[PDB]
Amino acid sequence: QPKPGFCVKTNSSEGKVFINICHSPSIPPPADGFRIPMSLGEPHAELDAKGQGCTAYDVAVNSNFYLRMQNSDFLRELVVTIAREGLEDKYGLQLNPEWRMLKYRSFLGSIS
């Protein structure tokens, strides 16, 4: 299991999609055509704040790396686009890119 990171919220042109961006030491880091080592989790149904279900995906990058990038708005944005295209390159989905990072929430509970 990987530890909670932040929670990106975006639609999918069919539904609400949260990308639970988590982290774990097991995953290799990349720094110190650019790609980033990250798992691409399996979909799980979670309920939004309203009370209607939606699809969350648990994506995990190198943990030690991650605490470095959670301070850089730039790195931040760079990882989220990538992962979104991982969920697209594996499930189609055609996620919306007008995504928001939740201020409060860091997950939609179900790490694995």
Binding site: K9, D48, A49, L102, K103, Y104, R105
Partner: peptide, 4 residues
């Protein structure tokens, strides 16, 4: 935001 609606969810937060």
């Amino acid at each position: 935001d609606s969810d937060d």
